[PDB]
Design a binder for this molecule. Structure first.
Ligand SMILES: COc1cc([Te]C[C@@H](O)C[Se]c2ccc(S(N)(=O)=O)cc2)cc(OC)c1OC
Ligand SMILES: COc1cc([Te]C[C@H](O)C[Se]c2ccc(S(N)(=O)=O)cc2)cc(OC)c1OC
Ligand SMILES: [Zn+2]
Length: 257
């Protein structure tokens, strides 16, 4: 099965998922001098006051914090988006070392990690229908750098011991994803893909310019997770990031001057 090892990592994915070599793959390098300010882009509307978190799951590739998306409780609107996108889950990608881990890069700079808040377009009715559409998903990407602790992350860090291995889940109610946001909602945006198989070309990417700070102790706890199942030889969950893909015939737009 696909993963992030020497034998099943990103350079292998094209054999089972040929869209890996497609025209709108993610992530990409954001060249900050080549991105054009688009004064027609609206401020992002992040409406997370009624978010209902349910569960946290180790899926063998990352961990997902899942939300109740059976109503408009936590939605993303505005910016480059038409209509209403409902939050379904968030997850991270991170490195074995602080100098790598992000999927997007900024002038080839890699951050220690990247948060992905995944949303689906309510005009398609469910997430599985939305991933078949070129405007099906909106993913809000937020870089993490190592410095001061992020207080709003600690409730996630403290549950990771209970989902160490693939297939483990834990109740995770009353988590407020507003505690993961930076101060500024300035962003870059471009049309792209899922960054894991099946690599579907269904994503409007919205990547925030301002990183959040997390502590070395917080990211060390991410790196204690396991790719393996319980009672299998330990393989640490690190370096679960896809490198930057060719931009091809795409333009990255900036919300800011
Ligand atoms: C949940 O129901 C389904 C789900 C799926 Te496609 C799930 C899973 O295999 C990948 Se979800 C995902 C989300 C975000 C990212 S990222 N890193 O942010 O780019 C990467 C991957 C297809 C289905 O049918 C078409 C479906 O039937 C209902
Ligand atoms: C504790 C709290 O639930 C976690 Se974070 C937070 C930060 C800021 C805002 S604000 N100032 O309403 O935009 C709302 C929520
Ligand atoms: Zn992701």
């Amino acid at each position: 099965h696909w993963g992030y090892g020497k034998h099943n990592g990103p350079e292998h994915w094209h054999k089972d998922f040929p869209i890996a070599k497609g025209e709108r793959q993610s992530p990409v390098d954001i060249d900050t001098h080549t991105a054009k300010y688009d004064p027609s882009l609206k401020p992002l509307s992040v409406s997370y006051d009624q978010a209902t978190s349910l569960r946290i799951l180790n899926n063998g590739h990352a961990f997902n914090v899942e939300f109740d998306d059976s109503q408009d409780k936590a939605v993303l609107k505005g910016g480059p988006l038409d209509g209403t996108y409902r939050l379904i889950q968030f997850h991270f990608h991170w490195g074995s070392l602080d100098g790598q881990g992000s999927e997007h890069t900024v002038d080839k700079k890699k951050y220690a990690a990247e948060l992905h808040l995944v949303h689906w377009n309510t005009k398609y009715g469910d997430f599985g229908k939305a991933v078949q559409q070129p405007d099906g998903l909106a993913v809000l990407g937020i870089f993490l750098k190592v410095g001061s602790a992020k207080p709003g992350l600690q409730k996630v860090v403290d549950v990771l011991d209970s989902i160490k291995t693939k297939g483990k889940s834990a109740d995770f109610t009353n988590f407020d994803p507003r505690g993961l946001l930076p101060e500024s909602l300035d962003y870059w945006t471009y049309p792209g893909s899922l960054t894991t198989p099946p690599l579907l070309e269904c994503v409007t990417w919205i990547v925030l310019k301002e990183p959040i700070s997390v502590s070395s102790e917080q990211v060390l706890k991410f790196r204690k997770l396991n790719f393996n199942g319980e009672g299998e030889p330990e393989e640490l969950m690190v370096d679960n990031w896809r490198p930057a893909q060719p931009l091809k015939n795409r333009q990255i737009k900036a919300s800011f001057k």
